[PDB]
């Protein structure tokens, strides 16, 4: 038992991380087969980052302007192109540690692991969720662009996120691996702001089930509610509305604990209207929404 | 910016994880050079686990009672011995992925990453602290014994923990890699209980500095206190007393923020006596004590 914010083991991704330098800008790249993927703003100076014209900037570069290092070994760039907000660098050597992989775009509410890297070197791994406003609450410093987010499915790495920038509220924005931003952001140093965020209700319910599985039961009650009555109060507290598909997704956890979904919604309703009043749930004094139903099953079942 | 519970990248450890079977008991082992380390209770049946005599149990086994699998490959056991609570299995093949490593015993208050494994297969990575009562608040299911805890120093993996068992409060106990338990526990299925835990004060102060570095300043005040006046109130709230060496250790964070240690102790004193009153710090409504000063510097500096 126990319950922790758990990341996927990162070894399969560590073998793909490289350093990419162009000019005096160094950031991280992802080396799969004979292609290195990295944020396109590697081709920018500080002058360019306020209003870059990336088409112009790219035609002014040649292959030998790109310095790619995989640890000690230099990789020779033999071709480049830009796909939306990423650069694709063709190199002369295919990465022998290329895992089975795919590129997937995730949805708000889903979680993934982040391998934070600097100068091509992995520094740390942590779990986060894609927020409803398409930002992530990460931990990133200068030089972290090109760090990637991923899930592991069986033997297969699904890459879902490449880091680009930090917004002024201290949250983070990036693209999928095809270079398309999550959310309404652009890779230029202008005034951009995230929209208002909401709490991911299905995830909160999943975490309440994790609590019951681990013996925290004080918030339960014998009441029940309906989907519409619950959604009515949830709107008022900036919670995402709950769908029948969410109820279905919580099925395995309902079965394991013998507590029906709409039963646990009535518990959540009371916690929203009355607070915790100084008690905790799984060691937290706030309602946690960055564990999916799948995360909970994976950790509380295996 | 941002602040997350961050684990070390696990790749260097993933390459050392093997599956160890003896009888119908399967658990994890650590394969370094030509030795596999695993919990000695792998040699137990369910009968034996209530009152094992491990000397007797071990002499009744031969090398061929031990099935060791590194993924697909079988390793041939050519010798065994017991060192305190671990078993050392000599195998015919040295692990070619052996990293530079050392065995270190950590102190209460220090943090490390855990690579949770089942059947020799890495499942997840998370950060935890060794509590003052020598337990860890982990997340472990049946089959997880032999999972290891580690820090990475430069190119060198320091192994500090091997998982053995869960106590009845749902916390976890294990040994260093020389087989010596942390805390007053034994590897038999008897009634054992952890002593009372306390809050790790130097870590709470480190986390308050992380908060200031990230722009959370509401809890600051212009007051100051002395080490003895602070320690006097901390005792009453089950906080570890603060030493001059702790003050020294917080130096880099004091310098970076321009807020003296004893200055921030006065802030902590007020938070203990008055609570948060519904505000949060770095997204938490409770005082967090599982980040060391080094963790904070590492994440808020690099
Ligand atoms: C003001 C700030 C935080 C420097 C800027 N932010 C915005 O202009 C805002 F609009 F998003 F607010 C921004 O992040 N960048 C500007 C420039 C890089 C991108 C950038 O410096 N990347 C960093 C890299 N490697 C990662 C950043 C640094 C702090 N922590 C991170 O995650 C471009 C091409 C977008
Ligand atoms: C009651 C319980 C939790 C099964 C027992 N606990 C105690 O007897 C207590 F005294 F600690 F309370 C215990 O853990 N074990 C008994 C047996 C194993 C050790 C054991 O089953 N290991 C597991 C393995 N692989 C890891 C455990 C399972 C749940 N989560 C973990 O971490 C020995 C040789 C100590």
UniProtKB/Swiss-Prot annotation, chains A, B:
Residues 1-302 form the Peptidase C30 domain. Changing residue 90 to R: In strain: Beta/B.1.351. 3CL-PRO exists as monomer and homodimer. Only the homodimer shows catalytic activity. Interacts with host FBXO22; this interaction promotes the proteasomal degradation of nsp5. It is found in: Host cytoplasm; Host Golgi apparatus; Host nucleus. The lineage of its organism: Viruses, Riboviria, Orthornavirae, Pisuviricota, Pisoniviricetes. It catalyses: TSAVLQ-|-SGFRK-NH2 and SGVTFQ-|-GKFKK the two peptides corresponding to the two self-cleavage sites of the SARS 3C-like proteinase are the two most reactive peptide substrates. The enzyme exhibits a strong preference for substrates containing Gln at P1 position and Leu at P2 position. Cleaves the C-terminus of replicase polyprotein at 11 sites. Recognizes substrates containing the core sequence [ILMVF]-Q-|-[SGACN]. Cleaves and inactivates human TRMT1, preventing tRNA guanine(26)-dimethylation of tRNAs. May cleave human NLRP1 in lung epithelial cells, thereby activating the NLRP1 inflammasome pathway. May cleave human GSDMD, triggering alternative GSDME-mediated epithelial cell death upon activation of the NLRP1 inflammasome, which may enhance the release interleukins 1B, 6, 16 and 18. Also able to bind an ADP-ribose-1''-phosphate (ADRP). The active site is at 41 (for 3cl-pro activity), 145 (nucleophile). Changing residue 132 to H: In strain: Omicron/BA.1, Omicron/BA.2, Omicron/BA.2.12.1, Omicron/BA.2.75, Omicron/BA.4, Omicron/BA.5, Omicron/BQ.1.1, Omicron/XBB.1.5, Omicron/EG.5.1. Inhibited by pyridone-containing alpha-ketoamides compounds 13a and 13b. In turn, alpha-ketoamide 13b (tert-butyl (1-((S)-1-(((S)-4-(benzylamino)-3,4-dioxo-1-((S)-2-oxopyrrolidin-3-yl)butan-2-yl)amino)-3-cyclopropyl-1-oxopropan-2-yl)-2-oxo-1,2-dihydropyridin-3-yl)carbamate) inhibits SARS-CoV-2 replication in human lung cells. Inhibited ex vivo by michael acceptor inhibitor N3. Inhibited ex vivo by compound 11a and 11b. It comes from the Viruses. This is 3C-like proteinase nsp5.
């Amino acid at each position: 038992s126990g319950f922790r914010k758990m990341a996927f083991p990162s070894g399969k991704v560590e073998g793909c991380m490289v350093q990419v330098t162009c000019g005096t800008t160094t950031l991280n790249g992802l080396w799969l087969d004979d292609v290195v993927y990295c944020p396109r703003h590697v081709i920018c100076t500080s002058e360019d980052m306020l209003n870059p014209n990336y088409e112009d900037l790219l035609i002014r570069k040649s292959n030998h302007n790109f310095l790619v290092q995989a640890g000690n070994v230099q990789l020779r760039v033999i071709g480049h192109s830009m796909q939306n907000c990423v650069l694709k660098l063709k190199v002369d050597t295919a990465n022998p540690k290329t895992p089975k992989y795919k590129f997937v775009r995730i949805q708000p509410g889903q979680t993934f692991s982040v391998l934070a890297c600097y100068n091509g070197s992995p520094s740390g791994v942590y779990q986060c969720a894609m927020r409803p406003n398409f930002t992530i609450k990460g931990s990133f410093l200068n030089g972290s662009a090109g760090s990637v987010g991923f899930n592991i499915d069986y033997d297969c790495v699904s890459f879902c996120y490449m880091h680009h920038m930090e917004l002024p509220t201290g949250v983070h924005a990036g693209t999928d691996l095809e270079g398309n931003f999550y959310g309404p952001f652009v890779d230029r140093q202008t005034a951009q702001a995230a929209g208002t965020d909401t709490t991911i209700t299905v995830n909160v319910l999943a975490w309440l089930y994790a609590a019951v599985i681990n013996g925290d039961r004080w918030f339960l009650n014998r009441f029940t509610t309906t989907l519409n009555d619950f959604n009515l109060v949830a709107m008022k507290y900036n919670y995402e509305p709950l769908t029948q598909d969410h109820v279905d997704i919580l099925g395995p956890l309902s079965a394991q604990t013998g507590i029906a979904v709409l039963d646990m919604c009535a518990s959540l309703k009371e916690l929203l209207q009355n607070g915790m009043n100084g008690r905790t749930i799984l060691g937290s004094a706030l309602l946690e929404d960055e564990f999916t139903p799948f995360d909970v099953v994976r950790q509380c079942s295996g």
